[PDB]
Amino acid sequence: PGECSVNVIPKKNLDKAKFFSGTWYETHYLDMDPQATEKFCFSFAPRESGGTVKEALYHFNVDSKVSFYNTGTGPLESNGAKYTAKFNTVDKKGKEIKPADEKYSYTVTVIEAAKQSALIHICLQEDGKDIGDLYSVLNRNKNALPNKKIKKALNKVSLVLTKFVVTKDLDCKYDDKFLSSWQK
Ligand code: HEM
Protein backbone atom coordinates (compact mmCIF):
# COMPACT_ATOMS: atom_id res chain seq x y z
CA PRO A 1 0.00 0.00 0.00
CA GLY A 2 0.81 3.69 -0.15
CA GLU A 3 0.20 3.75 3.60
CA CYS A 4 1.16 7.04 5.26
CA SER A 5 3.66 7.07 8.11
CA VAL A 6 2.61 6.64 11.71
CA ASN A 7 4.12 8.74 14.52
CA VAL A 8 3.86 12.01 12.64
CA ILE A 9 3.47 14.43 15.55
CA PRO A 10 2.36 18.06 15.03
CA LYS A 11 4.59 20.63 16.72
CA LYS A 12 3.14 21.91 19.98
CA ASN A 13 2.33 25.63 19.81
CA LEU A 14 3.63 26.42 16.34
CA ASP A 15 3.84 30.17 15.78
CA LYS A 16 1.24 30.44 13.00
CA ALA A 17 2.04 33.99 11.91
CA LYS A 18 5.70 33.08 11.46
CA PHE A 19 5.23 29.71 9.75
CA PHE A 20 2.34 30.82 7.54
CA SER A 21 4.28 33.64 5.92
CA GLY A 22 6.86 34.21 3.21
CA THR A 23 8.33 31.52 0.99
CA TRP A 24 9.63 28.13 2.11
CA TYR A 25 12.14 26.12 0.08
CA GLU A 26 12.48 22.38 0.36
CA THR A 27 16.16 21.61 0.91
CA HIS A 28 15.90 17.87 1.62
CA TYR A 29 13.10 15.42 0.99
CA LEU A 30 12.31 11.79 1.66
CA ASP A 31 9.65 10.21 -0.50
CA MET A 32 8.56 7.09 1.35
CA ASP A 33 8.15 5.27 -1.95
CA PRO A 34 11.72 4.05 -2.58
CA GLN A 35 11.00 3.86 -6.32
CA ALA A 36 9.99 7.51 -6.61
CA THR A 37 13.40 8.62 -7.79
CA GLU A 38 12.49 11.48 -10.12
CA LYS A 39 14.39 14.57 -8.93
CA PHE A 40 12.18 17.50 -7.92
CA CYS A 41 12.52 20.99 -6.49
CA PHE A 42 9.72 22.39 -4.36
CA SER A 43 8.79 25.72 -2.83
CA PHE A 44 5.57 27.08 -1.37
CA ALA A 45 3.89 30.09 0.27
CA PRO A 46 1.46 29.01 2.99
CA ARG A 47 -0.97 31.49 4.54
CA GLU A 48 -3.57 31.18 7.30
CA SER A 49 -6.61 33.21 8.34
CA GLY A 50 -9.67 32.30 10.40
CA GLY A 51 -8.59 28.68 10.69
CA THR A 52 -8.27 28.20 6.93
CA VAL A 53 -4.98 27.63 5.13
CA LYS A 54 -4.49 28.93 1.60
CA GLU A 55 -1.15 28.08 0.05
CA ALA A 56 0.53 28.46 -3.32
CA LEU A 57 2.66 25.50 -4.41
CA TYR A 58 5.51 25.33 -6.92
CA HIS A 59 7.15 22.14 -8.22
CA PHE A 60 9.95 21.74 -10.72
CA ASN A 61 10.64 18.40 -12.37
CA VAL A 62 14.39 18.28 -12.87
CA ASP A 63 14.17 15.10 -14.99
CA SER A 64 11.70 16.69 -17.44
CA LYS A 65 12.41 20.44 -17.00
CA VAL A 66 8.67 21.04 -16.49
CA SER A 67 7.22 23.21 -13.73
CA PHE A 68 3.75 23.07 -12.25
CA TYR A 69 1.72 25.41 -10.08
CA ASN A 70 -1.03 24.53 -7.63
CA THR A 71 -2.98 26.18 -4.87
CA GLY A 72 -4.34 24.35 -1.86
CA THR A 73 -7.05 25.27 0.63
CA GLY A 74 -8.32 23.65 3.79
CA PRO A 75 -9.01 23.87 7.52
CA LEU A 76 -6.26 24.11 10.09
CA GLU A 77 -6.67 21.61 12.94
CA SER A 78 -7.19 22.87 16.51
CA ASN A 79 -3.58 21.89 17.26
CA GLY A 80 -2.53 24.66 14.87
CA ALA A 81 0.18 22.65 13.09
CA LYS A 82 -1.71 20.30 10.75
CA TYR A 83 -4.10 20.86 7.88
CA THR A 84 -5.93 18.97 5.17
CA ALA A 85 -6.27 20.69 1.81
CA LYS A 86 -7.94 20.27 -1.56
CA PHE A 87 -5.90 21.60 -4.48
CA ASN A 88 -6.39 22.96 -7.97
CA THR A 89 -4.00 23.65 -10.83
CA VAL A 90 -3.12 27.21 -11.83
CA ASP A 91 -0.82 28.85 -14.34
CA LYS A 92 2.11 31.09 -13.46
CA LYS A 93 -0.22 34.10 -13.29
CA GLY A 94 -2.40 32.31 -10.76
CA LYS A 95 -5.34 31.61 -13.09
CA GLU A 96 -7.00 28.23 -12.56
CA ILE A 97 -6.28 25.91 -15.50
CA LYS A 98 -7.71 22.78 -13.90
CA PRO A 99 -10.33 22.61 -11.10
CA ALA A 100 -9.73 20.70 -7.86
CA ASP A 101 -10.51 16.99 -8.17
CA GLU A 102 -12.80 16.27 -5.22
CA LYS A 103 -11.39 12.77 -4.71
CA TYR A 104 -7.86 14.00 -3.89
CA SER A 105 -6.59 15.75 -0.78
CA TYR A 106 -3.39 16.04 1.20
CA THR A 107 -2.59 16.44 4.86
CA VAL A 108 0.37 18.53 5.94
CA THR A 109 1.81 18.17 9.42
CA VAL A 110 4.33 20.71 10.66
CA ILE A 111 6.51 18.48 12.84
CA GLU A 112 9.12 21.06 13.83
CA ALA A 113 10.16 24.65 13.21
CA ALA A 114 13.26 26.45 14.46
CA LYS A 115 15.01 29.62 13.33
CA GLN A 116 14.88 29.63 9.51
CA SER A 117 14.18 25.85 9.34
CA ALA A 118 11.15 23.57 9.41
CA LEU A 119 10.21 19.93 8.96
CA ILE A 120 6.91 18.93 7.43
CA HIS A 121 5.24 15.69 6.42
CA ILE A 122 2.62 15.31 3.69
CA CYS A 123 0.18 12.44 3.34
CA LEU A 124 -1.56 12.30 -0.05
CA GLN A 125 -5.01 10.71 -0.16
CA GLU A 126 -7.63 9.58 -2.66
CA ASP A 127 -11.17 9.18 -1.29
CA GLY A 128 -9.76 9.59 2.23
CA LYS A 129 -7.34 6.68 1.85
CA ASP A 130 -3.53 6.93 1.91
CA ILE A 131 -1.79 6.87 -1.47
CA GLY A 132 1.66 7.99 -0.37
CA ASP A 133 3.69 10.27 1.87
CA LEU A 134 6.83 12.37 2.01
CA TYR A 135 8.91 14.26 4.59
CA SER A 136 10.51 17.57 3.67
CA VAL A 137 13.06 19.79 5.37
CA LEU A 138 12.30 23.45 4.65
CA ASN A 139 14.43 26.58 4.90
CA ARG A 140 13.98 30.26 4.10
CA ASN A 141 17.29 30.01 2.19
CA LYS A 142 17.69 27.48 -0.65
CA ASN A 143 21.35 26.85 0.16
CA ALA A 144 21.04 26.50 3.93
CA LEU A 145 21.37 23.44 6.17
CA PRO A 146 18.73 22.55 8.74
CA ASN A 147 18.80 23.67 12.34
CA LYS A 148 19.76 20.84 14.71
CA LYS A 149 16.20 20.87 16.11
CA ILE A 150 15.12 19.45 12.75
CA LYS A 151 17.50 16.50 13.07
CA LYS A 152 16.28 15.87 16.61
CA ALA A 153 12.73 15.64 15.30
CA LEU A 154 13.81 13.24 12.56
CA ASN A 155 15.67 11.17 15.16
CA LYS A 156 12.60 10.85 17.37
CA VAL A 157 10.94 8.94 14.53
CA SER A 158 13.95 6.83 13.53
CA LEU A 159 14.79 8.87 10.43
CA VAL A 160 18.23 10.22 9.55
CA LEU A 161 18.95 13.19 7.30
CA THR A 162 21.44 11.25 5.16
CA LYS A 163 18.52 9.21 3.77
CA PHE A 164 17.08 12.38 2.26
CA VAL A 165 17.54 13.66 -1.28
CA VAL A 166 19.50 16.94 -1.26
CA THR A 167 18.11 19.60 -3.56
CA LYS A 168 20.84 22.27 -3.73
CA ASP A 169 22.84 19.88 -5.94
CA LEU A 170 19.92 19.59 -8.37
CA ASP A 171 19.61 21.91 -11.36
CA CYS A 172 16.55 23.66 -9.91
CA LYS A 173 14.59 26.40 -11.59
CA TYR A 174 12.28 28.39 -9.31
CA ASP A 175 9.42 30.75 -9.94
CA ASP A 176 9.97 32.99 -6.93
CA LYS A 177 7.68 35.78 -8.12
CA PHE A 178 4.67 33.45 -8.19
CA LEU A 179 5.21 32.81 -4.48
CA SER A 180 6.33 36.34 -3.51
CA SER A 181 3.16 37.78 -4.98
CA TRP A 182 0.88 35.19 -3.35
CA GLN A 183 -2.28 36.96 -2.09
CA LYS A 184 -0.88 40.36 -3.03
C1 HEM B 1 9.21 18.78 -0.54
C2 HEM B 1 9.47 17.96 -1.56
C3 HEM B 1 8.36 17.50 -2.53
C4 HEM B 1 8.61 16.74 -3.60
C5 HEM B 1 9.99 16.22 -4.02
C6 HEM B 1 7.36 16.49 -4.28
C7 HEM B 1 7.23 15.75 -5.43
C8 HEM B 1 6.07 15.61 -6.16
C9 HEM B 1 5.87 14.70 -7.26
C10 HEM B 1 6.92 13.72 -7.83
C11 HEM B 1 4.62 14.85 -7.70
C12 HEM B 1 3.95 14.11 -8.87
C13 HEM B 1 4.16 14.99 -10.10
C14 HEM B 1 3.68 14.27 -11.32
O1 HEM B 1 2.67 13.52 -11.21
O2 HEM B 1 4.30 14.45 -12.40
C15 HEM B 1 3.98 15.87 -6.88
C16 HEM B 1 2.69 16.31 -7.02
C17 HEM B 1 2.01 17.11 -6.13
N1 HEM B 1 2.45 17.48 -4.86
FE1 HEM B 1 4.44 17.36 -4.22
N2 HEM B 1 6.36 17.14 -3.58
C18 HEM B 1 6.93 17.77 -2.49
C19 HEM B 1 6.23 18.51 -1.56
C20 HEM B 1 4.88 18.81 -1.59
C21 HEM B 1 4.15 19.56 -0.58
C22 HEM B 1 4.80 20.12 0.71
C23 HEM B 1 2.87 19.65 -0.96
C24 HEM B 1 1.68 20.34 -0.25
C25 HEM B 1 1.82 21.27 0.71
C26 HEM B 1 2.75 18.97 -2.24
C27 HEM B 1 1.59 18.84 -2.97
C28 HEM B 1 1.50 18.30 -4.24
C29 HEM B 1 0.38 18.48 -5.13
C30 HEM B 1 -0.89 19.30 -4.85
C31 HEM B 1 0.72 17.69 -6.39
C32 HEM B 1 -0.13 17.55 -7.67
C33 HEM B 1 -0.83 16.19 -7.67
C34 HEM B 1 -1.67 16.05 -8.91
O3 HEM B 1 -1.51 16.89 -9.84
O4 HEM B 1 -2.50 15.10 -8.98
N3 HEM B 1 3.99 18.47 -2.58
N4 HEM B 1 4.90 16.30 -5.95
Ligand SMILES: NCCc1c[nH]cn1
Ligand atom coordinates in the same frame (compact mmCIF):
# COMPACT_ATOMS: atom_id res chain seq x y z
N1 LIG C 1 4.86 10.08 -1.33
C1 LIG C 1 4.17 11.26 -1.62
C2 LIG C 1 4.61 12.04 -2.84
C3 LIG C 1 4.19 13.45 -2.91
C4 LIG C 1 4.44 14.34 -3.98
N2 LIG C 1 3.91 15.51 -3.67
C5 LIG C 1 3.33 15.39 -2.44
N3 LIG C 1 3.51 14.14 -1.99
